[PDB]
Motif scaffolding. Structure first.
Motif, PDB file in Angstrom:
ATOM      1  N   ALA A   1       8.619   2.409  -2.041  1.00 53.31           N
ATOM      2  CA  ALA A   1       8.383   2.424  -3.477  1.00 53.31           C
ATOM      3  C   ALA A   1       9.100   0.933  -3.840  1.00 53.31           C
ATOM      4  O   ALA A   1       8.280   0.239  -4.582  1.00 53.31           O
ATOM      5  CB  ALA A   1       9.214   3.340  -4.250  1.00 53.31           C
TER       6      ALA A   1
ATOM      7  N   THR B   1       0.643  -1.192   0.114  1.00 49.55           N
ATOM      8  CA  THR B   1      -0.099  -0.015  -0.058  1.00 49.55           C
ATOM      9  C   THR B   1       0.858   1.392  -0.090  1.00 49.55           C
ATOM     10  O   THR B   1       2.021   1.409   0.234  1.00 49.55           O
ATOM     11  CB  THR B   1      -1.194  -0.029   1.222  1.00 49.55           C
ATOM     12  OG1 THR B   1      -0.288  -0.494   2.184  1.00 49.55           O
ATOM     13  CG2 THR B   1      -2.064  -0.851   0.864  1.00 49.55           C
ATOM     14  N   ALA B   2       0.008   2.407  -0.016  1.00 46.34           N
ATOM     15  CA  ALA B   2       0.261   3.697  -0.293  1.00 46.34           C
ATOM     16  C   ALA B   2       1.433   4.191   0.425  1.00 46.34           C
ATOM     17  O   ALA B   2       2.370   5.090  -0.163  1.00 46.34           O
ATOM     18  CB  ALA B   2      -0.808   4.684  -0.333  1.00 46.34           C
ATOM     19  N   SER B   3       1.551   3.726   1.663  1.00 48.11           N
ATOM     20  CA  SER B   3       2.808   4.326   2.443  1.00 48.11           C
ATOM     21  C   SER B   3       3.907   3.190   2.391  1.00 48.11           C
ATOM     22  O   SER B   3       5.112   3.565   2.628  1.00 48.11           O
ATOM     23  CB  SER B   3       2.390   4.372   3.904  1.00 48.11           C
ATOM     24  OG  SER B   3       1.529   3.269   4.184  1.00 48.11           O
ATOM     25  N   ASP B   4       3.673   2.367   1.834  1.00 45.02           N
ATOM     26  CA  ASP B   4       4.915   1.125   1.787  1.00 45.02           C
ATOM     27  C   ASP B   4       5.993   1.651   0.783  1.00 45.02           C
ATOM     28  O   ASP B   4       5.783   2.405  -0.235  1.00 45.02           O
ATOM     29  CB  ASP B   4       4.521  -0.112   1.454  1.00 45.02           C
ATOM     30  CG  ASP B   4       3.879  -1.228   2.252  1.00 45.02           C
ATOM     31  OD1 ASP B   4       4.168  -1.151   3.563  1.00 45.02           O
ATOM     32  OD2 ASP B   4       2.694  -1.601   2.059  1.00 45.02           O
TER      33      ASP B   4
ATOM     34  N   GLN C   1       6.133  -1.736  -3.105  1.00 44.09           N
ATOM     35  CA  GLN C   1       5.307  -1.469  -4.304  1.00 44.09           C
ATOM     36  C   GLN C   1       5.508  -2.187  -5.657  1.00 44.09           C
ATOM     37  O   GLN C   1       5.014  -2.689  -6.048  1.00 44.09           O
ATOM     38  CB  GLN C   1       4.917  -0.240  -4.227  1.00 44.09           C
ATOM     39  CG  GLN C   1       4.202   0.633  -3.332  1.00 44.09           C
ATOM     40  CD  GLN C   1       3.496   1.878  -3.440  1.00 44.09           C
ATOM     41  OE1 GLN C   1       2.989   2.015  -4.502  1.00 44.09           O
ATOM     42  NE2 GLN C   1       3.711   2.454  -2.509  1.00 44.09           N
TER      43      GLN C   1
ATOM     44  N   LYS D   1       0.176   2.193 -10.444  1.00 39.48           N
ATOM     45  CA  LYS D   1       0.850   2.548  -9.420  1.00 39.48           C
ATOM     46  C   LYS D   1       2.139   1.715  -9.235  1.00 39.48           C
ATOM     47  O   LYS D   1       3.176   2.311  -8.660  1.00 39.48           O
ATOM     48  CB  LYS D   1      -0.015   2.365  -8.229  1.00 39.48           C
ATOM     49  CG  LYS D   1      -1.377   3.109  -8.410  1.00 39.48           C
ATOM     50  CD  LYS D   1      -2.469   2.679  -7.090  1.00 39.48           C
ATOM     51  CE  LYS D   1      -3.570   3.550  -7.129  1.00 39.48           C
ATOM     52  NZ  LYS D   1      -4.260   3.318  -8.060  1.00 39.48           N
TER      53      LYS D   1
ATOM     54  N   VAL E   1       4.532   3.575 -11.440  1.00 33.47           N
ATOM     55  CA  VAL E   1       5.067   4.668 -10.803  1.00 33.47           C
ATOM     56  C   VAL E   1       6.198   4.529  -9.698  1.00 33.47           C
ATOM     57  O   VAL E   1       7.266   5.165  -9.597  1.00 33.47           O
ATOM     58  CB  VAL E   1       3.966   5.412  -9.990  1.00 33.47           C
ATOM     59  CG1 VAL E   1       4.233   6.462  -8.834  1.00 33.47           C
ATOM     60  CG2 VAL E   1       3.000   6.196 -11.002  1.00 33.47           C
TER      61      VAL E   1
ATOM     62  N   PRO F   1      10.179  13.122  -8.002  1.00 29.81           N
ATOM     63  CA  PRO F   1       9.926  12.052  -8.201  1.00 29.81           C
ATOM     64  C   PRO F   1       9.226  11.340  -6.992  1.00 29.81           C
ATOM     65  O   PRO F   1       8.708  10.098  -7.279  1.00 29.81           O
ATOM     66  CB  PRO F   1      11.240  11.017  -8.449  1.00 29.81           C
ATOM     67  CG  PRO F   1      12.200  12.044  -7.723  1.00 29.81           C
ATOM     68  CD  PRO F   1      11.444  13.704  -8.232  1.00 29.81           C
TER      69      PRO F   1
ATOM     70  N   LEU G   1      14.465   6.369 -10.910  1.00 33.40           N
ATOM     71  CA  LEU G   1      15.047   7.950 -10.872  1.00 33.40           C
ATOM     72  C   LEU G   1      15.932   8.165  -9.565  1.00 33.40           C
ATOM     73  O   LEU G   1      16.901   8.576  -9.981  1.00 33.40           O
ATOM     74  CB  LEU G   1      13.973   8.873 -11.155  1.00 33.40           C
ATOM     75  CG  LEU G   1      13.027   9.037 -12.497  1.00 33.40           C
ATOM     76  CD1 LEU G   1      11.926  10.053 -12.056  1.00 33.40           C
ATOM     77  CD2 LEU G   1      13.866   9.508 -13.608  1.00 33.40           C
ATOM     78  N   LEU G   2      15.459   7.576  -8.739  1.00 32.65           N
ATOM     79  CA  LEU G   2      16.385   7.649  -7.371  1.00 32.65           C
ATOM     80  C   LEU G   2      17.589   6.931  -7.576  1.00 32.65           C
ATOM     81  O   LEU G   2      18.440   7.304  -6.851  1.00 32.65           O
ATOM     82  CB  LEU G   2      15.582   7.266  -6.176  1.00 32.65           C
ATOM     83  CG  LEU G   2      14.463   8.283  -5.923  1.00 32.65           C
ATOM     84  CD1 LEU G   2      13.608   7.655  -4.623  1.00 32.65           C
ATOM     85  CD2 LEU G   2      14.632   9.876  -5.407  1.00 32.65           C
TER      86      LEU G   2
ATOM     87  N   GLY H   1       1.390   9.618   0.256  1.00 43.00           N
ATOM     88  CA  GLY H   1       1.159   8.455   0.937  1.00 43.00           C
ATOM     89  C   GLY H   1       1.452   8.292   2.186  1.00 43.00           C
ATOM     90  O   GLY H   1       0.401   7.931   3.021  1.00 43.00           O
ATOM     91  N   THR H   2       2.936   8.644   2.704  1.00 46.16           N
ATOM     92  CA  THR H   2       3.114   8.494   4.219  1.00 46.16           C
ATOM     93  C   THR H   2       2.391   9.458   4.991  1.00 46.16           C
ATOM     94  O   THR H   2       2.168   9.341   6.155  1.00 46.16           O
ATOM     95  CB  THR H   2       4.541   8.672   4.392  1.00 46.16           C
ATOM     96  OG1 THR H   2       4.563   9.736   3.607  1.00 46.16           O
ATOM     97  CG2 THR H   2       5.182   7.394   3.615  1.00 46.16           C
TER      98      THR H   2
ATOM     99  N   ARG I   1       9.149   3.823 -11.634  1.00 44.89           N
ATOM    100  CA  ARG I   1       9.773   5.248 -11.894  1.00 44.89           C
ATOM    101  C   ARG I   1      10.533   5.830 -10.836  1.00 44.89           C
ATOM    102  O   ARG I   1      11.484   6.373 -11.211  1.00 44.89           O
ATOM    103  CB  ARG I   1       8.687   6.118 -12.605  1.00 44.89           C
ATOM    104  CG  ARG I   1       9.229   7.382 -13.008  1.00 44.89           C
ATOM    105  CD  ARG I   1       8.230   8.322 -13.652  1.00 44.89           C
ATOM    106  NE  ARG I   1       7.162   8.379 -12.905  1.00 44.89           N
ATOM    107  CZ  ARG I   1       6.040   9.068 -13.008  1.00 44.89           C
ATOM    108  NH1 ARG I   1       6.110   9.582 -14.156  1.00 44.89           N
ATOM    109  NH2 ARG I   1       5.162   9.298 -12.141  1.00 44.89           N
ATOM    110  N   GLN I   2      10.062   5.991  -9.754  1.00 41.26           N
ATOM    111  CA  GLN I   2      10.485   6.576  -8.629  1.00 41.26           C
ATOM    112  C   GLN I   2      11.813   5.877  -8.400  1.00 41.26           C
ATOM    113  O   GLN I   2      12.917   6.515  -8.140  1.00 41.26           O
ATOM    114  CB  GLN I   2       9.747   6.512  -7.473  1.00 41.26           C
ATOM    115  CG  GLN I   2      10.418   6.788  -6.044  1.00 41.26           C
ATOM    116  CD  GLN I   2       9.560   6.925  -4.697  1.00 41.26           C
ATOM    117  OE1 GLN I   2       8.415   7.207  -4.812  1.00 41.26           O
ATOM    118  NE2 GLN I   2      10.076   6.756  -3.809  1.00 41.26           N
TER     119      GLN I   2
END
Lengths: 276, 261, 122, 260, 138, 260, 138
Positions: free
Chosen positions: E6, E1-4, E9, E39, E42, F69, E49-50, F76-77, E45-46
């Protein structure tokens, strides 16, 4: 070609230009076709980016405009003092989805003396060659037409422009006055006269004889569906039987009052023959 | 038939080369045996996507649309081997993917020049249930020449294209302004066009699982003739639907009756 | 929106506007004729014509009357109607062109920003 | 005239600066001899483009639509040297190319920031034989303010245009329903408008070697009077062709005489 | 989920896939839903890029096609020689302004064995499921 | 009420963290006191924007539209702490500013997935004078389930949307040709749709100074009802204007009398 | 003006604002007119592209909204305990083709306390001031 290294694709147009310059400079005339300037731009862009120069719009180097301008300017008409020789250039640019404003099409349009715009819609509608007559141009203009042609070209250019104003109405013209209904008719016949098969270029004298036919009104009562057949046969006839009138037109460079009268009869008797 | 495979479950590298392997096998039968080869590649776009996928790791500034700056030359040195010579003959049929459905995408766009004939398929046609979904006004062949296929072939083809073009132009307009004001001359081309549009579909023998129809293979003369007649007004009485998913024109006539009730 | 999508509508609303405009000039014509022919007779997509009669719907001497009238009113009606239809098509051709150029521009910037973004990450 | 040229084969930097060079020259006939010089930049778009090429070459990130980050300053540092100082003034006629027919394109948009008027040459007008083929309704000017040209000037001008506008309306009617439901009034607006359209044409001394006709340099005073009277109704009896290709209204009168 | 993170995910799909292959490789049958692959892209992608890997089309890694092909090729039908088990996948992708021609949307439509396209127009109109007959295929 | 602020005048970092700060205050009441909280945030788009402001400075390659990015994980968090739990309840209302009106913008685009109910406001509607300018075919709620709002509610709701969706497709043609050419049947959807569209607007106490009308609060059953009748053709005789800016349907009938 | 380095055009509004602030700060009342914030924005963007900051929507740097919020937050009405003074800002923004949805116009609308939109149509039609009374607000 396709498998030759970028730099050779890049150079090609210059090395061909030099070859045509030898003629230009020596009082001789030369014609050059660059097919296409779009692919060479790509070749150049490829080296520019691999040498890491800075990329601008469409990834093209800041000096892509200068690559073509320095090429297309080498074409010119010299002065007798220099031999009177010339170099005419027919550069080809491939547009995309008709985007004449994309980068490379914009440069080259901006560099040259005119453009012959071809269109798919026209092509598939039966107009071949697909020249969009309204948007095509010749900055040089009549300074380059013969008096014979001008004698006809001029009114044709004008009824066409006039048709172009009304054309759209045709297909819904549930009740147009005979004024404009006239221009629609001249419109479609003149248009059918501009049609042409490939590999069969005509002698300026043959072109005016045929143009004269519709421009003067002779094919106005003829069926649009037949003009292509008419011209073909009509031209076959005068190229056969009348090579003395065409030789006149040719020589006299224009349509004398005489040859004018001779053509009148030649077409009014041929037409009669034609709809028998 | 020899087969060579470098599918989608492979790393970019394999994908940037299978076509080469495939093509190499084919060149042997062309040159060392001198035979007539048939080359099928599905899908050559993958060769170019393969390259774009490692391109950045090769340290290159991207060209437009993300592609690598060497796309065209990379494509050129390859496409130039896929060819018939005096030694042997290759008849290559290459499937070409079109990213985002945009034919101007640097890849599909760069490939047109390597072909002698092109069959352009369209989701707008497919969407209507017309299969094969070829776009009649965007497909071309270098032999569509009266000097090569003949004037009957040629006049029909162009005849069919004019009417579909003529109808394309009216489409957006009768859409809003409706059809009443149209000249009987113009509502007949709407007719014929809509029937041709259908007569161009065909039940493939490899898509019965798709169409629920037996596959039909029509011979060149049955084709030319069928269209010649529709264009001639010889079926302005049958219903459009009679022309949809059928082989030869006779099936359209039979189907009319079956539909007759 | 897609430049290709926007160019379809524009392509077509440009036509609809010229058709519509042409239909009014016709409608005015017939309506000229009609107001004259109307004169004498009283001494004896057409707007909301066919409907107006249709809703409220639920010899010779007078037949030529209701006729000679119902045509002035009709050719009148089609006229104004097609007058505003091109008036509408024009507000749209001017409206769509702006959407076209905002998008045209936007597409070019978006791409360059993508290139620049990738070049800069090396 | 002094001619300064930056040909298309020249590198970005050259086509970039040549408009400044031309500027330099003009500034002299103003800062050294206090005249009223005329500056012609043909064409103002290629100036901007030259700017971008140079910019890209210097590796600077392009801005919106690919132009230079410094589009507005590159333009301002040049445009601003064109003015009326106490010593004299430079007036610039700039040929404008609008990309993609997009008037909100950054090149054109930036450029209008500086323009005080537009001279729209029209092929349609030319076709009326009318020359100069300037469009009286599309051409514009910032100084067409009564607070600047004076009420008289301002009213005549606004009189000429409206009439020209009204006639434009009727133009559609005339051709279709025929020229007559036309009122004692509607028939006058036309007449005059048609006289006006012509009175707005004129013979140039530059084209004497060719038109076999004598050039006219009508004075501002003569200009406002001319049109004033036509509006006024002073020459309603005169015939159209009396006004075609002449200078001052007086000539419209005399031509009428020779035209019986 | 959303806070896990990158990378969680990102991995999640491969993780879940592997749990499905257990059944696939043992003559059993599994069904996996990847909700959604948009998602994940994304996330990819994150993460990517990092790591300073040059962005590509639309800012995604030049290999986002590969990111999903690799995964979905794993859904498969094994022959009796391998247990006859199978893995069926139902990946989800979110379009914007119902535009299915979009690059990611087509990237994934070109990997799977068909698509079910749902339109909001049909949905509001009462047609639920909003399946678009014409544009969906198997 | 506890108030936390980090406004438009603060440097990016402050705007990037105040949400977290208001958030924390709320978390205390939820978990440390098992309290039922209400959390209002104006505007949560600003937190993301703040992030985009510092992101280049942190040295990151930008993602699409110049955003950072880490946009989604940052949302989210943070968004994941704004939630009800077994310990406490947090009803949170967050205003989400949409840049250039583009809902496809990474910021707003990434926020949909975190809500249970969304109220998408429209400039187009606002410009028609309908307030609140809510887009009826673009707002949604995970509670719009028959088993939660009851089928009466669920059927009026889907009823209203269906008619507005239908009106929406007719609009293209209505736009060039108006209503004339419309079917009697189609014109009835149009009438009803335009009356439903108006009945969706309403005066807020808070906006009294601008509506020129007294704020109204309509009870759910009054809403379900008023909309039923409209749908059901029980007011096809009233004029549209009767429905504009009112509370309960009963007031729409009255307004009709006053309109006479 | 048009000929001063971008940094000076960029700076100009902050300076004028400080001058207006003296009056606000001393029980007095000032009026500041920023003409235009459109051109200041392009000056700042020239600076930002030259410094190499990531170009975003319309190539504008990510912080152009703040270029403006910081500036316009300074107009303000103090209470008696602080002098009762005040600063009133009438910033000008130039739209292209009446497009009030552009990035810059929207930015600025989301900062001020109303707008006065002048329409070209109105202007020619002879209504001047070309104010659009329905669209404009306070």
């Amino acid at each position: 070609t396709a498998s030759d290294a970028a730099p050779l694709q890049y150079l090609a147009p210059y090395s061909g230009c030099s070859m045509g310059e030898y003629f230009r400079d020596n009082g001789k005339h030369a014609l050059i076709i660059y097919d296409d300037l779009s692919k060479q731009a790509v070749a150049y862009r490829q080296m520019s980016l691999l040498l890491r120069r800075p990329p601008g719009r469409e990834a093209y180097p800041g000096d892509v405009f200068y690559l073509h301008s320095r090429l297309l300017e080498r074409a010119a008409k010299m002065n007798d003092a220099f031999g009177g020789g010339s170099l005419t250039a027919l550069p080809v640019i491939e547009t995309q989805a008709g985007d004449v404003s994309a980068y490379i099409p914009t440069n080259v349009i901006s560099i040259t003396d005119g453009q012959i715009f071809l269109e798919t819609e026209l092509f598939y509608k039966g107009i071949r060659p697909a020249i969009n007559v309204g948007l095509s141009v010749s900055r040089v203009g009549s300074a380059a037409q013969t008096r014979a042609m001008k004698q006809v070209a001029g009114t044709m250019k004008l009824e066409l422009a006039q048709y172009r104003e009304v054309a759209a109405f045709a297909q819904f013209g549930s009740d147009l006055d005979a004024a404009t209904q006239q221009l629609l008719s001249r419109g479609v016949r003149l248009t059918e006269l501009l049609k042409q098969g490939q590999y069969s270029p005509m002698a300026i004298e043959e072109q005016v004889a045929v143009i004269y036919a519709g421009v003067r009104g002779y094919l106005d009562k003829l069926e649009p569906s037949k003009i292509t057949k008419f011209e073909n046969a009509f031209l076959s006839h005068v190229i056969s039987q009348h090579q003395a009138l065409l030789s006149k037109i040719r020589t006299d460079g224009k349509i004398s009052e005489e040859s004018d009268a001779k053509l009148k009869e030649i077409v009014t008797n041929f037409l009669a023959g034609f709809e028998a | 038939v020899a087969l060579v495979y470098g599918q989608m479950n492979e790393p970019p590298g394999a994908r940037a080369r299978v076509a080469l392997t495939g093509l190499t096998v084919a060149e042997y039968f062309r040159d060392q045996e001198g035979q007539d080869v048939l080359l099928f590649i599905d899908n050559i776009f993958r060769f170019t996507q393969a390259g774009s996928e490692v391109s950045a790791l090769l340290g290159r500034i991207p060209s437009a649309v993300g592609y690598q700056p060497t796309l065209a030359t990379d494509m050129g040195t390859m496409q130039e081997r896929i060819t018939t010579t005096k030694k042997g003959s290759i008849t290559s049929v290459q499937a070409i993917y079109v990213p985002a459905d945009d034919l101007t995408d640097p890849a599909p766009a760069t490939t047109f020049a390597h072909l002698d004939a092109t069959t352009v398929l369209s989701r707008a046609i497919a969407e209507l249930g017309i299969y094969p979904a070829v776009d009649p006004l965007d497909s071309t062949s270098r032999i569509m020449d009266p000097n090569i296929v003949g004037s009957e072939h040629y006049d029909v083809a162009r005849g069919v294209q004019k009417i579909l073009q003529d109808y394309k132009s009216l489409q957006d307009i009768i859409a809003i302004l409706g059809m009443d004001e149209l000249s009987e001359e113009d509502k007949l081309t709407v007719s014929r066009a809509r029937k041709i549009q259908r007569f161009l579909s065909q039940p493939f023998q490899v898509a019965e699982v798709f169409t629920g129809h037996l596959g039909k293979l029509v011979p060149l003369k049955e084709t030319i003739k069928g269209f010649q007649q529709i264009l001639a007004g010889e079926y302005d009485h049958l219903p459009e639907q009679a022309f949809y998913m059928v082989g030869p024109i006779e099936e359209a006539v039979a189907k009319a009756d079956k539909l007759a009730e | 929106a897609t430049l290709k999508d926007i160019t379809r509508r524009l392509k077509s609303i440009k036509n609809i506007q010229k058709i519509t405009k042409s239909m009014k000039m016709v409608a005015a014509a017939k309506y000229a004729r009609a107001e004259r022919e109307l004169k004498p007779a009283r001494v004896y997509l057409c707007g909301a014509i066919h409907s107006s009669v249709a809703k409220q719907m639920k010899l010779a001497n007078i037949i030529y009357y209701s006729l000679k009238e119902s045509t002035t009113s009709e050719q009148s009606a089609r006229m104004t109607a097609m007058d505003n239809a091109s008036k509408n098509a024009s507000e749209m051709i001017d409206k769509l062109t702006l959407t076209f150029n905002r998008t045209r521009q936007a597409v070019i910037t978006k791409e360059l920003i993508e290139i620049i973004s990738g070049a800069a990450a090396l």
